[PDB]
Amino acid sequence: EEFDAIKIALASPDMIRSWSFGEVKKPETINYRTFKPERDGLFCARIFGPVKDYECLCGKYKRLKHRGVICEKCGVEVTQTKVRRERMGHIELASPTAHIWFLKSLSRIGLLLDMPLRDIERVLYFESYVVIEGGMTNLERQQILTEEQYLDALEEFGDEFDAKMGAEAIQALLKSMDLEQECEQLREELNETNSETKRKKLTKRIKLLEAFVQSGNKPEWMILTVLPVLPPDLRPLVPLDGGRFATSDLNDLYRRVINRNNRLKRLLDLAAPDIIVRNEKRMLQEAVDALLDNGRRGRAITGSNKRPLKSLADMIKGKQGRFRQNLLGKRVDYSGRSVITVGYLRLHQCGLPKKMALELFKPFIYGKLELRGLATTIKAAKKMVEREEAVVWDILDEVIREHPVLLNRAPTLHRLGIQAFEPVLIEGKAIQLHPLVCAAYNADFDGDQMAVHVPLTLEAQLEARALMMSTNNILSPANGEPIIVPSQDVVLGLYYMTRDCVNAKGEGMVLTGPKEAERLYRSGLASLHARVKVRITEYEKDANGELVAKTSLKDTTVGRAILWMIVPKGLPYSIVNQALGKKAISKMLNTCYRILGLKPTVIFADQIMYTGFAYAARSGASVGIDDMVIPEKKHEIISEAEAEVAEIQEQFQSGLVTAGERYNKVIDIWAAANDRVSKAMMDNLQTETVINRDGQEEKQVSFNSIYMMADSGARGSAAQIRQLAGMRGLMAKPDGSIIETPITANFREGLNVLQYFISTHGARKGLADTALKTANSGYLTRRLVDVAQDLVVTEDDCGTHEGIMMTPVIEGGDVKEPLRDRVLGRVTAEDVLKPGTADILVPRNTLLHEQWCDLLEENSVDAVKVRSVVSCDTDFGVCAHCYGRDLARGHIINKGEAIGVIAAQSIGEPGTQLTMSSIQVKNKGSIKLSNVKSVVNSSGKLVITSRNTELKLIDEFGRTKESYKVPYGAVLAKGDGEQVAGGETVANWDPHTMPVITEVSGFVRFTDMIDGQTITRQTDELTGLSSLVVLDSAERTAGGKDLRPALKIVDAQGNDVLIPGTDMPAQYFLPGKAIVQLEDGVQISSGDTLARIPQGLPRVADLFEARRPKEPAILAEISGIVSFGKETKGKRRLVITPVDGSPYEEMIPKWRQLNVFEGERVERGDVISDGPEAPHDILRLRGVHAVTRYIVNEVQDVYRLQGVKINDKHIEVIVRQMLRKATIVNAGSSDFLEGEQVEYSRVKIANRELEANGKVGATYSRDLLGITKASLATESFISAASFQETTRVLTEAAVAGKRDELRGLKENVIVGRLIPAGTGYAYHQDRMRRRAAG
């Protein structure tokens, strides 16, 4: 029963006989008259067991008095019939046939022989021979001879050479090779030439060749000589109702193995000619291959239905295999389902029907009808429950009390899709749900269904109360925001009650508390929204958790006083003294949770739902056709735009305008006529109740019901009243382009026929998008679970140094994430201090909660270093300090919490939602340029002469607010180190021109540019002021193409005038489109240019897949000056000659524009060409912290564009699970350049760089893999075989002798064990100390 690991290897022919209980000799299944299993067949009772409990086939022994006998008349052991599920048999093949899995799966048998797979199959099909051993020096081993050439060497040699055909030849080649001599050969000649593409061909062999020495396998076992047989109760032949039978597809596949094997023994007795015997061995190979893997070697063997027979590999592999349909998910007892409807319930309750709860809790009632003496036996309690007597419904009410039950709505996109509730028995057929948990389930009552699950044992009834109860889950685990926001009818009754009217009733009267603001409303003496003065009393915790009070008169309405009797005595009065839309009740609940706790939040969230439902019915809110108003000027705004569409029409008729200028003028006109209609409806909606009070006229916010549903945020938005009141925009036909005229009608005036047929272009284009993208997101979430499977918090403090530096996301425009959003919840990595220095806030690691966030709000600090998850030093897991705050609870995370499944379900849950010149300073801030190189230009300003410089905007405090990018050779209208206010286009450049501006002030002469060789003579005949022109490489002449054009800045003597302070010559080499403005001899100053060179859901999937971009950005490997090599043979070269370092080059396209020139130094990890960059290169050149900053900034722009807030720790904890493999460069423990687990390489250097050795350890590179690639490369072969490519995983795991030690969460779901996470984490730590202590 108890095991520890799961070992996989190859099966010896002696081992397959060891599992067996007898040999199958006949293809007969059962007898047709009396349906009994025949001897020596596929269902034989002497081999596999008896068919009934303790009975032989004849009937000589029975009924357990004879237990250990074998009935000699028939031969059937008198035992149970449960052993027909466990006993195997075997078939002795008359010819050895190859295994299809170690031959076709890419090759494990031509990798070991170093034969090509297209050449082994000529031997297997009995087409051409192969030399097994050539004793004479003419022929070589593994030499393929045709049937006309084998006859020639048959006469010339006789006995002197060994040559066979079929799998009896390949069994001899595998039996003859010495595995030890080839590891003593491949380790000898590898030091000759370590060329790259031949290296992993050798390393494919050496790891295979050492596996057959270590793991105990032998290479002959690829060729099957004995075949095992499945037990008969796993491939049954059962009778159906109407006299038929129904069989497995494996019985048809075992019969043609046996029939073609018995017929081969009949051809070796008659001495058949060797064409009949060759075709029979070629037919037995087809039958054994189709049984193991059907449609793999040839055409698939179909049955009598034309669909193919389901083989043995099809029962393990795929979505309908054992690994995904019966092991990771199961059908489950004590469960039911029904239609859900709305509840009066509390937050921890649900409505369960009585006819449903009697069947779910049925053995719980039998245990109390027997205990109470109301039934004398169990089968008498079966009679009383089915009768539904009066005592049954009084015992069901005592069983259900304090017994929680799980409610599940599929699809379960995140963990809040299954929660626990305490049942309240109702007399109906529908489950009654609470209205506040419908946001977490994403459930509406339009026909949805939910499943119920009864927790059985005593530890499953306490996890449902302490972990999965509905009051435990009010925060979200993705982001920290609350998830119990009241949705649509609670906000309407709150927006109506806490509103203001100028002229209602009882204006200005004074009230002695909130309790008589309800006496005035109920007796009709006052209105609900009416300005009065109320004496109130509020409580605060200025003391050390003790309530202090104060009493004063406020200036409020009547309806805001009736709401104050709900707010629970720790909050201010300013939380209910506003209009209270949807976002104001969403943070009223959050203010209660942070000051008062969990217990006053669950009570306050129910009483909000009771008061929102009650006063939304007291009002009476409807929608008539008068509530959809039209602007009166709607016809004249269209007629103003219908005039400007015929003004441009005659210009197309005259011919002044083209079609290209006409199209973006018609689209520009209708995009501005739509905005005036959409604005005149909102001037006619939000204030149209021009109401008066004790005077002439005033203006207040209107009481229109479609505006009240939008201003509260109850349902709809401003962009959906637009199609109700104004015109409904322009519509795009599904080619990509936009139809020229808009739909000028709305849904109140009604559309046309051509205006309706246009609208069904884009209403099916979006509807076929929603149906066809939930498959693309359910595959991404399945891939993210596998990568982050076994990541469990298994420590408390790993004691590591710094990790990711945090910074705002102020690039491009305004602040999108401030410091209070990225850093709240993390742990500080080093001792951080203030701009006013020497103020340490930390003992080097604190939890940075909301109070420390306000301490960072005060000072000018805008850069912190936090403990990330990629930098965590724990082997096999992370610690609770490198993860930070558990977001769903609000404290530091515990141990044993499965944070990798929380990460995948938080990234994959919004995935079904989101498929769809001049630099102006805007604000008073300083100008600072960092990493700067510049030169004072020809006018009195500054110009930029480096690519790595960006504009920073510092206000009067010390932080950066705005950030802009400025290219090489741009023109800045101001300088550096200044304080200039906003509203100034401070930087300017030509968006065509990429200039070549010069730092040196000196004269320029023509040198080394001869016409017809490198340059041409092209002048501007309109002006005359021109020069020579330098084109690109693909345009100039072949006279001087190999030499680079070199325009030298000269003086009166004729020398290269240097940069002042530096000695190297700085004169520009000339790439393409280099046309100088002025001629020979003219001087240029500092900063004067020589020449001018003119000009969704798959994105998140391809980032985590780590795809290769089509035009990758080329980068630099080392610092120093670069140069060029070859010219136009395939591609150019990049000769690197550094100031100290050693002749690296690269096949580089010279038609992709560069950034540096021939004479410019470039640094390592810098950018050479233009385009996107691959994530494999950011890890190769820059560190492990620069590829995680690239991903969590790029995958966040897709999410945050849709307003989807996900914490950044959820991305770094699956980026860490991609940076999990490591290649080695040196050696001393393991091989030279093989891939290796980086958790084990840090252990092998923790054993050798420490005192056991001086230094024999290994230095290592670091690799990056995609999610579908890093999940198949794990130490565990079961987490990979249950995911994808079960054939390819199990073949490379069985020839290596791997063992699974069952650490993951997925690997214990399969074997039926406790999970090493959550409640089961304390159980597995006993097993990890039971292993070492005996």
């Binding site: 095992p228 393990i316 998910g329 044992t457 779901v1309």
Partner: protein
């Protein structure tokens, strides 16, 4: 629909599917990941063994409820050693390395 105990399948010995078969609800892959994110390990172990597939351990859980002893004594599921006989029928020796 509701079901406490009923009919089970032939090869896998798991409960059937559908209202006409008096079948249990499917506890698929996505509902296992939500029980792992909560931390509920005893709720998950009972749905994989005694609610579904462990034959000798689901008849003990039935009597333990009638006796008033909410205690699960689990075993290895019958779907896992149906898988072990199928990989061994492919000529691949897979075993359990016991203590």
């Amino acid at each position: 629909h509701a079901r406490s105990t009923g009919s089970y399948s032939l090869v896998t010995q798991q409960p059937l599917g559908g209202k006409a078969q008096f079948g249990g609800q499917r506890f698929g892959e996505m509902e296992v990941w939500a029980l792992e994110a909560y931390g509920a390990a005893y709720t998950l172990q009972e749905m994989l063994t005694v609610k579904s597939d462990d034959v000798n351990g689901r008849t003990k859980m039935y009597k333990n409820i009638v006796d008033g002893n909410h205690q699960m004594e689990p075993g290895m599921p019958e779907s896992f050693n149906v898988l072990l006989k199928e990989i061994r029928s492919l000529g691949i020796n897979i075993e359990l390395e016991d203590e």
